[PDB]
Ligand binder design. Structure first.
Ligand SMILES: Nc1nc2c(ncn2[C@@H]2O[C@H](COP(=O)(O)OP(=O)(O)OP(=O)(O)O)[C@@H](O)[C@H]2O)c(=O)[nH]1
Ligand SMILES: Nc1nc2c(ncn2[C@@H]2O[C@H](COP(=O)(O)OP(=O)(O)O)[C@@H](O)[C@H]2O)c(=O)[nH]1
Ligand SMILES: Nc1nc(NCc2ccc3c(c2)OCO3)cc(-c2cccc3[nH]ccc23)n1
Ligand SMILES: [Ca+2]
Ligand SMILES: [Ca+2]
Ligand SMILES: [Cl-]
Ligand SMILES: [Mg+2]
Ligand SMILES: [Mg+2]
Lengths: 423, 53, 437
């Protein structure tokens, strides 16, 4: 039933806010929190993400976290900013200076208890909490360090609930500081241990999509975050609308994750919008499987698919959908592991997103994701072999040993992906 | 092909046509369920010990 | 008169139950409010339909049925739908959180907390029977609840009602409408744990029903409603002998006596004909000979397999409608000279035949046309073992990599149970080969 949403830091809070705008529009909820839709299908499972307050008001089940105030002031002034509950804003003053150790061990620790109090108050009033989703980046200090601290405390107090993240992975092509590879390696180590599902969103890929396909000479953060919000809408559609299926986050996890550590998913979206030509089912199918629509900069022909979910939205022929999904599997069979039968699953929702007649969202558990971690590992090593920029971290109390251990964990994850790719 | 044992009622009839001749007790169930629950307790305690470290 | 209690477990079992009880109401003339005007004995009786329906002093006819699910959303539709007044609330049992397609969560973790409540409500129904025969149990192989809770329940019913017969109706998994990869694990684990507790089990492969709906009803993409209405016709054909006057299969024990001489080999194949579309303008009606012939075509079977390459151990023909014995015997004589029907040597070559004069009922505004005569064949043939082979092959593929095993271990199951169940399946395939070849 109920999901609790958490957004931490600058990146996390910008994409989180965009997510709430898009889905609030789909459910017919305006910025004041009043329902003005045309169809009972919009409200029948509204309670998954929204609480009902007095006056038939709908309030997002959302907690907003940062170590500095700036971005949460921008949220509060943003177009839908009044819809969030005021008591759910939890912010410090110091900042974390793009420093994972400040987020995880010093500045963040002072705030974490007050954040957990609000989480507990939201969970306490849930009829039947299914679990949690977190939005954050891995390259900074607050979302990365404090986000993974939060993940650890939530597991300790709610050990049998599902913990899911949408995680933005750094790239030198879109970079704020040189230390991003350190912060990302430290964070992945935590995710391998403490999440059930992590959507890998690579700023490299989002940039290449804006540049090559959508034709934009200077992509802003706003342009990248538009794709992210559309993808997240796609991926939560099956819980959010009456589509026959009787599912919860745990049944989805059981269907998608064959080994506990290999739970990092590659998202995609079709069609890519910045037009009027409607799109045939063959075209949706061909484009959703195309490398160029993937949100993690990995070649799926360089690995094999452990599992795939496809979600189609809009009015279309289910016969034709089945035929096209079968066509792609039968003609490209070598990229799908033979030892998990029937590992491609398909959903259809009648309600299309805003501004499109037909769309498709892709979720892949592919061994080609090892390419992303290798990237990060090389950037890590190039600095760590000379200890460059380490004094920022040891000054907050960390030893070199912790860096060596994190590096080892991530090289092991890569080796595991390779083991299942050669089988 | 011998037709034998015809029976008849107001709602139908039946017959046969021949073409050719030729547990654990409650205690054990309870024990098994409790052993599984104990294994779950053990795994949960190992997790929480990791987190205290 | 001897009572029969039905138990519907998990999503598939509950929805199939709904279709069956709707059809029984239409066949017996019981309205959705429970009244039965043709019943002149108010507040009781030992008529044949009383095997399945009790009576209140107000003339309400109440199903002898329990619905059980671990989440509430499917049974709530029963609570609010057309037949809501038919069922007593204590008959409708729900939990808060489902088994997430995981046999171990259904059997161990969640089942342990609801099993005593379920047995208590069953006991409540049993205390109203003067000569309880046993149970009819409806479930999927693939769901966490249908597999794991059902097996737990079957063990406990053997403990608490050790003299009573138990029949199963089982939905075998098909990728064309399935939503999970782990269905083969759940199917093998539940078959292993239930095998000694079930006297007779009718397997229905969703793939066969899907293709019959597409080919013969002209439905482009069948839904669960289509599938369940057809399945409900077949179930009704099987239970009619318990619900109407007659001399064949009049009690649960007789199913085993007539169909199952080897206790582990207790999975009869069902074949049903004719299935004809309501939208089809004029239908030229099929004779006894043609519909009895249709029983030997694989396309009409509830499990796709080839009976020419196995052996028969028993056979029953259940006719409904305008049928006299002379035509049955003439059809059988013709069919024997044309088809490959070979029995095992220690069993006689023969058919037990039942005829009920009331034609089949159909649901108004449904996809099925009304016909003047129909037949269900129940044959115990070794060819059904092909389905076990298919499932076992898929199991072997995944277990060699231990794919998904951690989800089961984390609920407290030991890895050894996987291989105990698999080896029991290996011995079952061996039994069918030794008997059949
Ligand atoms: N024929 C038929 N099959 C169904 C129906 N509903 C579900 N199934 C099949 O049952 C299998 C899944 O089992 P479910 O009944 O949905 O699972 P469950 O018993 O409710 O257990 P949970 O996992 O706890 O929800 C799949 O193979 C489905 O195709 C139905 O109404 N009719
Ligand atoms: N896609 C995307 N990436 C962002 C956004 N804001 C920052 N980033 C990236 O996230 C990393 C910086 O982390 P940031 O969120 O600013 O740090 P924090 O405030 O301490 O959590 C760098 O990789 C940036 O390129 C955003 O709005 N969208
Ligand atoms: N694992 C997984 N898969 C998803 N895709 C669709 C799907 C459809 C039918 C399926 C299936 C998957 O698996 C078997 O049948 C979405 C999600 C998700 C994640 C995080 C937050 C979420 N809020 C709502 C949903 C969701 N999580
Ligand atoms: Ca301080
Ligand atoms: Ca009466
Ligand atoms: Cl008793
Ligand atoms: Mg920043
Ligand atoms: Mg269910």
């Amino acid at each position: 039933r109920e999901i609790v949403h958490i957004q931490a830091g600058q990146c996390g809070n910008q994409i989180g806010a965009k997510f709430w705008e898009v889905i609030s529009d789909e459910h017919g909820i305006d910025p004041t929190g009043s329902y003005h839709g045309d169809s009972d299908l919009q409200l029948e499972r509204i309670n998954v993400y929204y609480n009902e307050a007095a006056g038939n008001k709908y309030v997002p089940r959302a907690i907003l976290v940062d170590l500095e105030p700036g971005t949460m002031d921008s949220v509060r002034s943003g177009p839908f900013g009044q819809i969030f509950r005021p008591d759910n804003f939890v912010f410090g003053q110091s900042g974390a200076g793009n420093n994972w150790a400040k987020g995880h061990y010093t500045e963040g620790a002072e705030l974490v208890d007050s954040v957990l109090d609000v989480v507990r108050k939201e969970s306490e009033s849930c009829d039947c909490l299914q679990g949690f989703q977190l939005t954050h980046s891995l390259g900074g200090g607050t979302g990365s360090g404090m986000g993974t601290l939060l993940i650890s405390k939530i597991r300790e107090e709610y050990p049998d609930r599902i913990m899911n993240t949408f995680s933005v992975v750094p790239s030198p092509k879109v970079s704020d500081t040189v230390v991003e590879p350190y912060n990302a390696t430290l964070s992945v180590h935590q995710l391998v241990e403490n999440t059930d599902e992590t959507y890998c969103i690579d700023n490299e890929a989002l940039y290449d999509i804006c540049f090559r396909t959508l034709k934009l000479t200077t992509p802003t953060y706003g342009d990248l975050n538009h794709l992210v919000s559309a993808t997240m809408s796609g991926v939560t559609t099956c819980l959010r609308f009456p589509g026959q299926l009787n599912a919860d986050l745990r049944k989805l996890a059981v269907n998608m994750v064959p080994f506990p550590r290999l739970h990092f998913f590659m998202p995609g979206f079709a069609p890519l919008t910045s037009q009027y030509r409607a799109l045939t089912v063959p075209e949706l199918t061909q484009q959703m499987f195309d490398a160029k629509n993937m949100m993690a900069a990995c070649d799926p022909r360089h690995g094999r698919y452990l599992t795939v979910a496809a979600v189609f939205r809009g009015r279309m022929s289910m016969k034709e959908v089945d035929e096209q999904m079968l066509n792609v599997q039968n003609k490209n069979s070598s990229y799908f592991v033979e030892w998990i039968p029937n590992n491609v699953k398909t959903a259809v929702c009648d309600i299309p997103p805003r501004g499109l007649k037909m769309s498709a969202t892709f979720i892949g558990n592919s061994t080609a994701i090892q390419e992303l971690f290798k990237r990060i590992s090389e950037q890590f090593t190039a600095m760590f072999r000379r200890k460059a920029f380490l004094h920022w971290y040891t000054g907050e109390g960390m030893d070199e040993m912790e860096f060596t251990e994190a590096e080892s964990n991530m090289n092991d994850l890569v080796s595991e992906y390779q083991q299942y790719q050669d089988a | 092909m011998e037709v034998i044992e015809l029976n008849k009622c107001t709602s139908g009839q039946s017959f046969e046509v021949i073409l050719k001749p030729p547990d654990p007790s409650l205690e054990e169930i309870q024990k098994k369920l409790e052993a599984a629950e104990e294994r779950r307790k053990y795994q949960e305690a190992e997790l929480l010990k990791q987190l205290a470290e | 008169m001897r009572e029969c209690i039905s138990i519907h477990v998990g999503q598939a079992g509950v929805q199939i139950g709904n279709a069956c009880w709707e059809l029984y109401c239409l066949e017996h003339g019981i309205q959705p409010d429970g009244q039965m005007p043709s019943d002149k004995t108010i507040g009781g009786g030992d008529d044949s339909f009383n095997t399945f329906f009790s009576e209140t002093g107000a003339g309400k006819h109440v199903p002898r049925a329990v619905f059980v699910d671990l989440e509430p959303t499917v049974i709530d539709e029963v609570r609010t739908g057309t037949y809501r007044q038919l069922f007593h609330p204590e008959q409708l049992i729900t939990g808060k959180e489902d088994a997430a397609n995981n046999y171990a969560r259904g059997h161990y973790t969640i089942g342990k907390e609801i099993i005593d409540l379920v047995l208590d409500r069953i006991r409540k129904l049993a205390d109203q029977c003067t000569g309880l025969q046993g149970f009819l149990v409806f479930h999927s192989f693939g769901g966490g609840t249908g597999s794991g809770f059902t097996s737990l329940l079957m063990e406990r019913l053997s403990v608490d009602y050790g003299k009573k017969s138990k029949l199963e109706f089982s939905i075998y998994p098909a990728p064309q409408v399935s939503t999970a990869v782990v269905e083969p694990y759940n199917s093998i684990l539940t078959t292993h744990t239930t095998l000694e507790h079930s006297d007779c089990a009718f397997m229905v492969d969703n793939e066969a029903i899907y293709d019959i709906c597409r080919r013969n009803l002209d439905i482009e993409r069948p839904t669960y409603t289509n599938l369940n209405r057809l399945i409900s016709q077949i179930v009704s054909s099987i239970t009619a002998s318990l619900r109407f006057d007659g001399a064949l299969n009049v009690d649960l024990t007789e199913f085993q006596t007539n169909l199952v001489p080897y206790p582990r080999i207790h999975f009869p194949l069902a074949t049903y004909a004719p299935v004809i579309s309501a939208e089809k303008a004029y239908h030229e009606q099929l004779s006894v000979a043609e519909i009895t012939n249709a029983c030997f075509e694989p396309a009409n079977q509830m499990v796709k397999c080839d009976p020419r390459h196995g052996k028969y151990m028993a056979c029953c023909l259940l006719y409904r409608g305008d049928v006299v014995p002379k035509d049955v015997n003439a059809a059988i004589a013709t069919i024997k000279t044309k088809r490959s029907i070979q029995f095992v040597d220690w069993c006689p070559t023969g058919f037990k035949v039942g005829i009920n004069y009331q034609p089949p009922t159909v649901v108004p505004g449904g996809d099925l046309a009304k016909v003047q005569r129909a037949v269900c064949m129940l044959s115990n043939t070794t060819a059904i073992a092909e389905a076990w082979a298919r499932l076992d092959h898929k199991f072997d593929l995944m277990y060699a990599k231990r794919a998904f095993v951690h989800w089961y271990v984390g609920e407290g199951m030991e890895e050894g149970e996987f291989s105990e169940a698999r080896e029991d399946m290996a011995a079952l395939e061996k039994d069918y080969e030794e008997v059949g070849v």
